[PDB]
Structures are given as C-alpha cells and as structure tokens.
Protein: Outer surface protein A
Organism: Borreliella burgdorferi
Amino acid sequence: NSVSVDLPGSMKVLVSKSSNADGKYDLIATVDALELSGTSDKNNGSGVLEGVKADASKVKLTISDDLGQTTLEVFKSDGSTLVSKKVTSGGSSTEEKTTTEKIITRADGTRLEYTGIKSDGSGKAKEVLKGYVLEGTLTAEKTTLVVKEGTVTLSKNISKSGEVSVELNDTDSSAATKKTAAWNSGTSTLTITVNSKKTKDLVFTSSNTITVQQYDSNGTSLEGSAVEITKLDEIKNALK
Amino acid sequence: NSVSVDLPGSMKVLVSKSSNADGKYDLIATVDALELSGTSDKNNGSGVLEGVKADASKVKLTISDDLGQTTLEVFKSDGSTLVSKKVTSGGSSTEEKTTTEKIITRADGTRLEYTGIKSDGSGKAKEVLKGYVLEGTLTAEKTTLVVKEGTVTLSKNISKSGEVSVELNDTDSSAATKKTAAWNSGTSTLTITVNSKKTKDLVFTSSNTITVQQYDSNGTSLEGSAVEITKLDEIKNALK
C-alpha cells in the first residue's frame, strides 16, 4: 500500500500511495520512539507531522518540499514555546536546545550553581562553600556532589525537596581498609567504619559546613572535639 | 512627597505619599540603569512595576504584599517568554537564566559546539576538528577560537555570515623573534613573518584542515610540500 521515503537525518516517512477525498496524502513516521503523523498536498513525502510524547509537549517534524531538509521541532506542553530544534540538510545538521542556568545563593554566602540544565532536569552542579567547592551533577530526581579519594567516593545528595543525605562507597577489597558508612537523618551525621571499628563522624551542619570527629581506637565513643572542615583536602583526608 | 521603601535584594521602591482619585498608589523604581513604573492597591510599597531596556526588552518587578520577597523578571521585547528571573526572600536569592546551546555538525565530522549562549549573544564556542579541538568564545558579531604559544596569540574568527579570517598577535618585544602575520582571504592563507623574512604559510581549507608550508631561509618562496596539521601541537609549533 503505502510507499516509504528516506529523509535527511536517517529518518523515514511513510506516504500513502493514493490520495484521499480531500486531495491530500497521509504522512506517518516514528522519530526516536514516538509516532508522528499528518497530511500534505504532495506525494513525494514532504509536509508536516505532529505528535506528543509522555509529557504533553508537542513535536513537529517538517519535511521540506524537495526533501532536502528536515526540521524537527519540540515545544512545551502548550505547543507554544520551543525546547529543541534540529535542522538537517545535505549531510549537515544544526541542533538548538533551550537550556537553563540557576544560581541559588544562601543567607550565609554559600551557593549552589547549576549550568546546562536540559528539558530532562540534567545538568552540571556545584556547591560553592567556604574555602572549597563540591562539583557534581543533577538529574530530575536529585543533585549529587562527589568527592573521591583513592578507592572511596563520597556522594552528597540533595533531594528535590532540598533534603540532604550523604553516602560513601569504597570499592576496596581488603576488609582491613574498606570503608562503610551509615547516615542518620536525625543528626545530619555520617559514621564511617573500617575493619569493624568506627573511625569518623562527619557532621553536615545547618550552616552548610562539615565537622569531622574521630572515635577512639576501640571504635566505642568519640575523642577530642569536632574540627570544622576548611578545604577539600581535609575532606579527602577524612576519606582516607 | 513620595516615600522610599527598602526591598530585598538591596533594592528601593518609591511610592507616593497618598493615592489618586481612583484610589491607587504610584510605584516608581530604578533597577540598575533602567527605571520601572506601576500602580498598586497598597501603600507599603508592594505591587508590580514594569519597564523596557535600553536594548528593547520587557522587565517586570514584583514585590509581595508584606515586602518579604522580590521577583525581578525579564522577557523578550515581545514580553511573553522568560529570559531571566531572580527571586530574593529572606536574604537568599535564586536567579534563573534561559540559555541556548547549538551544535552545528558539518558533513565531514567537524563540529562547532556553542554552549551557554545568553541573551546578548555571548557564549562559549568550541570547534571540534579532526585530530584536535580549538576552544574560544562567541559574541553576537563573531566567533573567535584562540590558540596561544609563548607570546603568540592566533585567533580564528568566524563572522556572523560564516567567513573564516585568521590573525596573529605577538607581544615579544625583541625584533628578532617577534612574529607578524598577514591574512589573504582570496586564498584563506595566513603568512607569518619573522625578522623581516616570511617564514610560514598557514592555509585554512574548505575541509576544516590547516596546512603549514615553510619558506626557505630566503624569505621569498615556499619550499617542499605543505603538511596538514594533525594535532594541536603542530599548530603551536607553527606558532613557535
């Protein structure tokens, strides 16, 4: 029945072999994983096609009359404002993406900077603190700032609600050095432990700072006083 | 007369001492070097103010009925799409800028990646060629990719139209090693001169490749064959 026509950008349009009562042809396609359709006055496979993904957002693929160009536009749920736009023609493609950048500044001066936020909530993230910064990423579900030392990765997650939760992963094999950790929401504290004995309590203060306090060699209670971290190096040290 | 009122974000509004016949108050303000004007139903200074920039663009400030949170908002001169948005509450700000990102991938695998394009036309532009990546910057008038070696700055400009023109600057004072350069657009050829004698021809081609060819110690003609640059190091050498 319907013919198939190849398009710039490695896409395929399906064009009805014969016209309907109105004198128009039915165009179908499937860009990525989403079905697009429409009608046109021409039989080669040129025209406009539309669709909607999981969200309300509207999608419009425009095949130019001579099949030399293809314009894939993606707007907001209202079908009004542009999110993405990809123009392909003669091997060359131009891709425009509307992104966003957000700088949250806190009462104490410490900031949270997101750059290159795309429509899916992804983007680079960075917490600028006092004397050091924590770089990381941001997805639609949480922000994760990372600090790695040797075989240990420290993840500070910030939920969409702004909730803070810390975890620590040690790929080390020797159970004499492997660090495990337990987070207590009720205290903003994370307790590390190497070889069946707790070693450090990392407290994340309401003042967007971190204190570190060592246990005794028996890993029973604490000793001395907590020292507030000032540079990234002290964090890494605590992670050793 | 008109009374001044303090506002989060280190701002100040000017609200008439008493209302008009319709019973409203006149809010006048100036943010940065642009002024905004509105009318409100309350005397404390809350309400909406509006303006338009010296570059023609819509802006709408909004104070809250309790004066607790301020909301600066900029649009396109069309005044119906979000550009900037800064909200200060309790001393904590929260700014937001919509930025675009374009990825022009040429038909030969060479790319031009513009990221963080802001409203003025500024942004970070990086050209990804075959074997090396040039980095630079984007203004509303021209893209400029830079390569520096010693006291030599080589700049490759891509005009708004797309014309590629290259220039060379040298801050070396000694007139025995200071390089100079002349651009010939009829051939896309940059010619380097060291100590009054011409030394190198750097040709930027249609395939987004650079070829370097030495003159003789004469300083009067090309000797041998031109060689295509394959990585950044050969460029920097050409600039030595």
